Amino acid sequence: GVFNYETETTSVIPAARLFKAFILDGDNLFPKVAPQAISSVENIEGNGGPGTIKKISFPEGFPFKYVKDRVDEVDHTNFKYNYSVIEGGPIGDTLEKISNEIKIVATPDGGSILKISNKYHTKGDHEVKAEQVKASKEMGETLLRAVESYLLAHSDAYN
């Protein structure tokens, strides 16, 4: 079945810049700005558009080693980005896939808001462990703060 988690978080980075950096170039930035959240991101197949498969490896010590994610949709017009966790980590005989949808919206002060949906598809019926969901938000928050700090400090990047 499908468990749907929604949350919002604020960012001090304007929407378009965050989308270009955090979303579209996350695969290159995350290991660079947060080597203690993500050790590496490998493009297995594809250029970054729909269908692209990436292997995200976590640092030694993390609960999970790696996941493979599939890019589902990249919507520059609406700053929407959809991707799915399709293998590794929590994926297995209880969990088919985690489908994620991110939307970045501008705020009048020049920051942004990230509206996030995480849709866990279980095979089960095992229920999705709350520890696992809380861990997903904590990681998302960690990556965002690290990417924010590096966009604030490198003004010529992603403009």
Side-chain angles (χ1 to χ4, degrees), residues 1-19 21-35 37-128 130-159:
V2 183
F3 303 75
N4 183 21
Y5 295 99
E6 310 191 279
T7 191
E8 298 196 355
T9 181
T10 73
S11 174
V12 297
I13 306 302
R17 189 158 182 245
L18 192 58
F19 190 78
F22 177 72
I23 296 294
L24 294 180
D25 213 37
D27 52 2
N28 303 345
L29 269 181
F30 296 153
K32 179 232 262 286
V33 313
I38 302 297
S39 57
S40 68
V41 184
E42 174 174 34
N43 196 291
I44 301 300
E45 157 276 320
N47 230 351
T52 296
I53 307 296
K54 308 182 185 177
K55 185 180 178 176
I56 296 71
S57 294
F58 302 106
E60 192 175 18
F62 273 65
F64 302 114
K65 189 176 187 182
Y66 58 83
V67 288
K68 279 175 199 148
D69 289 358
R70 184 186 64 209
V71 180
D72 298 315
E73 211 161 67
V74 182
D75 180 356
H76 171 258
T77 297
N78 300 118
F79 301 140
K80 285 168 69 181
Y81 186 88
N82 301 343
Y83 72 97
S84 297
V85 182
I86 65 168
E87 196 174 349
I91 306 304
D93 61 12
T94 69
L95 184 62
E96 297 177 311
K97 170 183 70 166
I98 309 166
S99 297
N100 304 129
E101 300 182 346
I102 308 277
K103 182 171 198 314
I104 307 185
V105 295
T107 62
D109 65 346
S112 56
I113 297 194
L114 291 83
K115 307 188 177 192
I116 305 142
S117 162
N118 303 130
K119 284 183 159 199
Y120 287 68
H121 296 250
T122 58
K123 14 183 81 175
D125 289 357
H126 305 283
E127 65 178 324
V128 177
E131 53 174 37
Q132 216 172 50
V133 182
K134 194 160 84 167
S136 76
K137 181 65 254 166
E138 189 181 26
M139 167 73 63
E141 192 73 17
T142 301
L143 293 172
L144 176 60
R145 299 318 163 198
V147 167
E148 283 185 329
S149 179
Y150 180 86
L151 292 171
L152 293 169
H154 298 81
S155 66
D156 89 317
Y158 307 102
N159 297 124

